[PDB]
Design an enzyme around this catalytic site. Sequence first.
Site, PDB file in Angstrom:
ATOM      1  N   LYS A   1       0.857  -1.125  -0.037  1.00 40.27           N
ATOM      2  CA  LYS A   1      -0.142  -0.060   0.062  1.00 40.27           C
ATOM      3  C   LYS A   1       0.889   1.158   0.146  1.00 40.27           C
ATOM      4  O   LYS A   1       0.268   2.287  -0.306  1.00 40.27           O
ATOM      5  CB  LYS A   1      -1.042  -0.045   1.220  1.00 40.27           C
ATOM      6  CG  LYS A   1      -0.635   0.193   2.630  1.00 40.27           C
ATOM      7  CD  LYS A   1      -1.646   0.309   3.554  1.00 40.27           C
ATOM      8  CE  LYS A   1      -1.228   0.461   4.981  1.00 40.27           C
ATOM      9  NZ  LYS A   1      -2.353   0.647   5.792  1.00 40.27           N
ATOM     10  N   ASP A   2       2.207   1.252   0.496  1.00 37.61           N
ATOM     11  CA  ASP A   2       3.205   2.254   0.201  1.00 37.61           C
ATOM     12  C   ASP A   2       3.772   2.626  -0.988  1.00 37.61           C
ATOM     13  O   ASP A   2       4.161   3.654  -1.481  1.00 37.61           O
ATOM     14  CB  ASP A   2       4.048   2.432   1.194  1.00 37.61           C
ATOM     15  CG  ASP A   2       3.635   2.177   2.649  1.00 37.61           C
ATOM     16  OD1 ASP A   2       2.512   3.061   2.782  1.00 37.61           O
ATOM     17  OD2 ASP A   2       4.075   1.853   3.625  1.00 37.61           O
TER      18      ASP A   2
ATOM     19  N   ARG B   1      -9.307   7.182   3.776  1.00 38.07           N
ATOM     20  CA  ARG B   1     -10.202   5.706   3.261  1.00 38.07           C
ATOM     21  C   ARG B   1     -10.742   5.217   4.555  1.00 38.07           C
ATOM     22  O   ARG B   1     -11.961   4.998   4.450  1.00 38.07           O
ATOM     23  CB  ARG B   1      -9.104   4.707   3.003  1.00 38.07           C
ATOM     24  CG  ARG B   1      -9.718   3.404   2.861  1.00 38.07           C
ATOM     25  CD  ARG B   1      -8.564   2.420   2.384  1.00 38.07           C
ATOM     26  NE  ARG B   1      -7.483   2.063   3.551  1.00 38.07           N
ATOM     27  CZ  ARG B   1      -7.653   1.436   4.460  1.00 38.07           C
ATOM     28  NH1 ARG B   1      -8.852   0.528   4.737  1.00 38.07           N
ATOM     29  NH2 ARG B   1      -6.743   1.222   5.393  1.00 38.07           N
ATOM     30  N   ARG B   2     -10.093   5.311   5.799  1.00 35.19           N
ATOM     31  CA  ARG B   2     -10.482   4.832   7.144  1.00 35.19           C
ATOM     32  C   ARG B   2     -11.569   5.744   7.773  1.00 35.19           C
ATOM     33  O   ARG B   2     -12.744   5.401   8.034  1.00 35.19           O
ATOM     34  CB  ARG B   2      -9.326   4.428   8.236  1.00 35.19           C
ATOM     35  CG  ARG B   2      -8.541   3.182   7.531  1.00 35.19           C
ATOM     36  CD  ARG B   2      -7.389   3.142   8.660  1.00 35.19           C
ATOM     37  NE  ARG B   2      -6.812   1.827   8.512  1.00 35.19           N
ATOM     38  CZ  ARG B   2      -5.574   1.551   8.747  1.00 35.19           C
ATOM     39  NH1 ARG B   2      -4.617   2.678   9.034  1.00 35.19           N
ATOM     40  NH2 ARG B   2      -5.048   0.431   8.559  1.00 35.19           N
TER      41      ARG B   2
ATOM     42  N   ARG C   1      -0.019  10.001  13.647  1.00 33.20           N
ATOM     43  CA  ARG C   1       1.027   9.983  12.758  1.00 33.20           C
ATOM     44  C   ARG C   1       2.292   9.248  13.740  1.00 33.20           C
ATOM     45  O   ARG C   1       2.004   9.237  14.841  1.00 33.20           O
ATOM     46  CB  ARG C   1       1.667  11.272  11.863  1.00 33.20           C
ATOM     47  CG  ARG C   1       0.758  11.798  11.110  1.00 33.20           C
ATOM     48  CD  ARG C   1       1.076  13.054  10.819  1.00 33.20           C
ATOM     49  NE  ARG C   1       1.341  13.854  11.972  1.00 33.20           N
ATOM     50  CZ  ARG C   1       0.199  14.817  12.233  1.00 33.20           C
ATOM     51  NH1 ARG C   1      -1.019  15.351  11.315  1.00 33.20           N
ATOM     52  NH2 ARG C   1       0.376  15.618  13.406  1.00 33.20           N
TER      53      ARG C   1
ATOM     54  N   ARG D   1       2.203   5.155  17.935  1.00 34.59           N
ATOM     55  CA  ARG D   1       0.920   5.260  17.858  1.00 34.59           C
ATOM     56  C   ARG D   1       0.135   4.535  19.020  1.00 34.59           C
ATOM     57  O   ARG D   1      -0.559   5.365  19.742  1.00 34.59           O
ATOM     58  CB  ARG D   1       0.241   4.471  16.540  1.00 34.59           C
ATOM     59  CG  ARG D   1       0.531   5.516  15.275  1.00 34.59           C
ATOM     60  CD  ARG D   1       0.037   4.804  14.064  1.00 34.59           C
ATOM     61  NE  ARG D   1       0.418   5.551  12.677  1.00 34.59           N
ATOM     62  CZ  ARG D   1      -0.596   6.226  11.950  1.00 34.59           C
ATOM     63  NH1 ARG D   1      -1.617   5.842  12.245  1.00 34.59           N
ATOM     64  NH2 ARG D   1      -0.168   7.023  10.790  1.00 34.59           N
TER      65      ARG D   1
ATOM     66  N   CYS E   1      -1.220   6.508  -1.993  1.00 38.60           N
ATOM     67  CA  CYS E   1      -1.448   5.748  -0.472  1.00 38.60           C
ATOM     68  C   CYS E   1      -2.430   6.763   0.498  1.00 38.60           C
ATOM     69  O   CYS E   1      -3.077   6.317   1.357  1.00 38.60           O
ATOM     70  CB  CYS E   1       0.048   5.620   0.217  1.00 38.60           C
ATOM     71  SG  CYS E   1       0.135   5.928   1.974  1.00 38.60           S
TER      72      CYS E   1
END
Length: 299
Positions: A69-70, A117-118, A135, A141, A228
Amino acid sequence: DNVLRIATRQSPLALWQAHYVKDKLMASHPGLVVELVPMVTRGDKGLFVKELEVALLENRADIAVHSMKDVPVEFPQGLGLVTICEREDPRDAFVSNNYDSLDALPAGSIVGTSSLRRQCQLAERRPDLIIRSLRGNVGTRLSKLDNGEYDAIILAVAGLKRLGLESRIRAALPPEISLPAVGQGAVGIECRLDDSRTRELLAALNHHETALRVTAERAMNTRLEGGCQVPIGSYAELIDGEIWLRALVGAPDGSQIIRGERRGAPQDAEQMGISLAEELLNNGAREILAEVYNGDAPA
Ligand SMILES: *Cc1[nH]c(Cc2[nH]cc(CCC(=O)O)c2CC(=O)O)c(CCC(=O)O)c1CC(=O)O
């Protein structure tokens, strides 16, 4: 020359993936010397991939390891994705200390994630929740959650399992509830396309089925000129011999979410993803993406 140099980021998860790829290379070629060349990245679009590609173009390394995904949709001439490893759980995860599920979160709770997206999917269902940016590496996190800065956070199931933190997963969210990011759960390897020796060594690491799924996912995103960080979901499964591709593009606030799907033969994976993308574009995705990219809009 029997030596293979791996370029990678310096986060715990990035180094984990470097070892995973090393171990696989050693298992299938016991006489190879593998060297890790740690970098750093701007992310520490494509802020988190550029230094690695530079390392490849000037021969400082031979392969670059990324989480699918990156990986950016466009590549500098001479470079490209050549190996997609076996996919791990591709689902998003609900992580919280005080609550067991999203339903239990009272109005006003703070959920942390920088993913549009989330975010768009969470806002569509629960407009009463407050979504705040988050971030840093998984470790920092988790620290901010523990310090009471957030009531809950959303992270990928694969990241947590890989780091041995599976116990943090309060609940794995179904793809129907939170459609994964393209390639989430898979590791991909980029290298110089003309380096036949390196490419030959990589062949044994490629996982066919995963490559088929991810191809459908990426073709969809490439057409949307996604990256991304955009409110785009793109997820494929191999169901009874066919690929089932689902996609969505939504307004960050959850007001509008455009959805669509395709089902077909494995070999039509790329055309399928492009077709679904064009259906979403002509259905309003273009307008949403233009507000996100602000001006720059997909063809
Ligand atoms: C594109 C994008 N990257 C990230 C950060 C990220 N990258 C890899 C991982 C581990 C999981 C994996 O290998 O797939 C992570 C962190 C994680 O998702 O747990 C994100 C997430 C940004 C955020 O939630 O703040 C994204 C955007 C996206 O997923 O839509």
